[PDB]
Design a protein around this ligand. Structure first.
Ligand SMILES: [Zn+2]
Length: 257
């Protein structure tokens, strides 16, 4: 099936998922000079104090830290959002080298990795129903640069050895996602899609301007993961990012001036 290789990578996805060439695909390059401050944006509200993580899973494309979204605990509100969006999981996209890895780019600049905190609009009842709506999801994107270590990320890094291959999962409770957030909540926002098949166009993207710094050793451990399942030839899980897609008829709005 789909992947990030030469014969099943991003340029091949359109064959099974025609929406890959759609009108609001993600990620996109964020041209900072073209982005415009939007006064209609309300303050962004990230409420993760009640977040309840449950487990971490290597799905063969990345690893997901899943949360219990059966109640309104960890939620994202405000900004360009109408209503409440509930956190369901977060994952990253990274490269084989520090010079690449992020999906969104800033003035064509690629960061070492990108964190995606995925939320679904509670007005739709569940994630499945939400992905059938133009405003069903909200993904908070955060860039990762290599430098000082991110203390709040170490617990994730240290559990990766237990989910090396596709299909493996491990209990991962009491992880606080607040430790992965940068100081500033300044952001860019635009309507887009899931960056992996099925590439559904139900996402309101909120990409933070301030990147978090992680250490070389931390990202190196991300690169030790496998795309393959246990007992199969090793295919390092690196460069699991989709490149920038056509902006088309969209405007990127900034929360700051
Ligand atoms: Zn993602």
């Amino acid at each position: 099936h789909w992947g990030y290789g030469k014969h099943n990578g991003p340029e091949h996805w359109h064959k099974d998922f025609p929406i890959a060439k759609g009108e609001r695909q993600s990620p996109v390059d964020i041209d900072t000079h073209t982005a415009k401050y939007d006064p209609s944006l309300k303050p962004l509200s990230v409420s993760y104090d009640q977040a309840t993580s449950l487990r971490i899973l290597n799905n063969g494309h990345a690893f997901n830290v899943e949360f219990d979204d059966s109640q309104d605990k960890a939620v994202l509100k405000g900004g360009p959002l109408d209503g409440t969006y509930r956190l369901i999981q977060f994952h990253f996209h990274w490269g084989s080298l520090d010079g690449q890895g992020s999906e969104h780019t800033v003035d064509k600049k690629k960061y070492a990795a990108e964190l995606h905190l995925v939320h679904w609009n509670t007005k739709y009842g569940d994630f499945g129903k939400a992905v059938q709506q133009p405003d069903g999801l909200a993904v908070l994107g955060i860039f990762l640069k290599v430098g000082s270590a991110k203390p709040g990320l170490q617990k994730v890094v240290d559990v990766l050895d237990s989910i090396k291959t596709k299909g493996k999962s491990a209990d991962f409770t009491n992880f606080d996602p607040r430790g992965l957030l940068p100081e500033s909540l300044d952001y860019w926002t635009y309507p887009g899609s899931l960056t992996t098949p099925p590439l559904l166009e139900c996402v309101t993207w909120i990409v933070l301007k301030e990147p978090i710094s992680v250490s070389s050793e931390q990202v190196l451990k991300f690169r030790k993961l496998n795309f393959n399942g246990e007992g199969e030839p090793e295919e390092l899980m690196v460069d699991n990012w989709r490149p920038a897609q056509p902006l088309k008829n969209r405007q990127i709005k900034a929360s700051f001036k």
